[PDB]
Curated annotation (Swiss-Prot), chains A, B:
Keywords: Chaperone, Disulfide bond, Periplasm, Signal. The chain holds residues 31 to 106 of 110 of the full protein. The keyword rRNA processing does not apply. GO terms for cellular component: outer membrane-bounded periplasmic space. The keyword Transcription regulation does not apply. Required for optimal acid stress protection. Exhibits a chaperone-like activity only at low pH by suppressing non-specifically the aggregation of denaturated periplasmic proteins. It is found in: Periplasm. It comes from Escherichia coli O157:H7. Belongs to the HdeA family. Disulfide bonds join C9-C57. The gene is hdeA. This is Acid stress chaperone HdeA. One of its GO terms (biological process) is cellular stress response to acidic pH.
Length: 76, 76
């Protein structure tokens, strides 16, 4: 019931493992965007950065999830 | 390399099974939206409607994926 842009790293860590790439891609589409028609879905990128984000969120449980996504994503 | 908003049902069917809920959520965040701050990620919904979408795309391989998502999603 919490909008994704208000999740903390704790909220994300409570999402079942199988749907953690989905939360990351959701947050990416939502935020990190140009124009909807140009938005590309980089399945290798999401697959690669999700574990990084799970680790980052574990060490920083009250940070904003979407900001961690944007951050991790930039630093590869 | 194809923006998600230009995928046909065929493009979606070529995505590995494990990343098909991610493609559906991505398409939803992208399109089916109010305001980013209010966008909610309904993980049960995405889990339930993905198989429906895979089936609908199978019987309509040249239909636009994102439109199929919006459609399936509406009809439960």
């Amino acid at each position: 019931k919490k909008p994704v842009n208000s999740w903390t790293c704790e909220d994300f860590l409570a999402v079942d493992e199988s749907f953690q790439p989905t939360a990351v891609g959701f947050a990416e589409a939502l935020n990190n965007k140009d124009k909807p028609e140009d938005a590309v879905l980089d399945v290798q990128g999401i697959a690669t950065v999700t574990p990084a984000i799970v680790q980052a969120c574990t060490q920083d449980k009250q940070a904003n999830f979407k900001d961690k996504v944007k951050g991790e994503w930039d630093k590869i």
